[PDB]
């Protein structure tokens, strides 16, 4: 039972659902509980004097703000959800979130399309860290955009491929996918001409028939003279296995940005780390 916090009827529904689930063993999720900091305290006291069913679970989704009571934080286990640390982690999360049966479907090219989608999503989400240069503002390129892009890819591939096991890369509706991602899915958030130009950059560079060649490069001159190579596989597990063997030497050149873009940031955080190590002394 999912309940959104904020209204009196919401509090009544939350109380009723928790009271039912602590006996039945069902699950209760409460969303945006940070908007009612006072009620969270009575919720914590109610939870403390309670011996619910074995399978009962209570999830409280919230934003990271100081209004959340400290006692509630101590009473429960905290999980922080944020952008993945790097391109490899982002692509691994993307591949884990999408079901295996979805990627492995009638056309074998769907797996490579999904891999391209994951790489694209990882690149644009990782460029958000270098906010002045990677983009012009902190766009909210998130998981909903990834779902919309996956749905678009599925719909247009199914339309083009009437259940055929294999289709030619030139027959893939590249223009439809590129336009829908540059105008509706990812371009909808973009409110700048130059950010739109950069999105069109990435979409034209990545989504093309040349992405199905063995000589395709995902990125160029990442460090020195080597470059990221497009995997030659045709199955989802092979793409995931390629993602697992990423060098773990990510640089902003992976994103197309200059390598020095992180030099200030990686400096500040480093100093920041010292400060934290000094604050806990």
């Amino acid at each position: 039972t999912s309940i959104a916090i904020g209204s009196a009827e919401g509090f009544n529904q939350a109380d009723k659902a928790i009271n039912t689930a602590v006996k039945s063993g069902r699950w209760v999720m409460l969303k945006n509980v940070h908007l009612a900091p006072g009620w969270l305290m009575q919720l914590e006291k109610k939870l403390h004097s309670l011996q619910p069913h074995a399978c009962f679970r209570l999830f409280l989704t919230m934003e990271i703000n100081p209004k959340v009571p400290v006692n509630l934080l101590r009473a429960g286990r905290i999980f922080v959800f944020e952008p993945p640390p790097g391109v490899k982690a982002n692509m691994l999360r993307t591949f884990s979130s999408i079901p295996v049966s979805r990627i492995c479907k009638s056309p074998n090219e769907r797996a490579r399309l999904y891999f391209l989608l994951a790489w694209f999503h990882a690149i644009i989400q990782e460029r958000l860290r270098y906010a002045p240069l990677g983009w012009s503002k902190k766009y909210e390129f998130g998981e909903s955009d990834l779902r919309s892009a996956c749905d678009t890819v599925d719909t247009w591939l199914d339309d083009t491929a009437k259940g055929r096991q294999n289709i030619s890369p030139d027959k893939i509706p590249w223009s439809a996918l590129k336009t829908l991602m540059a105008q509706s899915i990812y371009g909808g958030r973009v409110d700048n001409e130059f950010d739109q130009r950069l999105l069109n950059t990435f979409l034209e560079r990545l989504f093309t028939t040349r992405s199905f060649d063995s000589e395709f490069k995902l990125a160029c001159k990442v460090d020195g003279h080597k470059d990221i190579q497009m995997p030659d596989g045709i199955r989802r597990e092979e793409f995931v296995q390629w993602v697992e063997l990423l060098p773990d030497t990510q640089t902003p050149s992976w994103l197309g940005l200059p390598n020095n873009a992180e030099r200030v940031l990686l400096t500040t955080q480093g100093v920041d780390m010292i400060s934290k190590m000094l604050k806990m002394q």
């Binding site: 240069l133 200059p258 390598n259 020095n260």
Partner: protein
């Protein structure tokens, strides 16, 4: 007439877009052209070694991020920023080519 030959720093002006509009207006009035049919051309030269014609205005303090300018041509660089010595903004008639 002397105000045309001075080089200003666009970052040191409260409203630099007003300066761009004023230079465009000056060029349009000088040549009796229409204001809406003027486009801007950029020529990067040294501050001392430069000449301003009836349509050129000098600008200082512009910084090129991630690129270097040689012979008014841009090349990618690993430097954070490169100081452009002097920039000539020259208003010309639109060609639509």
């Amino acid at each position: 007439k002397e105000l045309k030959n001075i080089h200003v720093c666009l970052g040191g002006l409260f409203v630099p877009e007003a300066y761009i509009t004023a230079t465009r207006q000056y060029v349009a009035q000088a040549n009796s052209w229409s204001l809406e049919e003027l486009c801007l051309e950029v020529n990067v030269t040294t501050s001392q070694g430069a000449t301003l014609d009836a349509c050129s205005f000098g600008v200082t303090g512009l910084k090129l991020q991630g690129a270097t300018c040689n012979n008014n041509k841009l090349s990618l660089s690993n430097a954070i920023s490169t100081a452009l010595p002097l920039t000539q903004l020259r208003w010309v008639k639109q060609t639509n080519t």
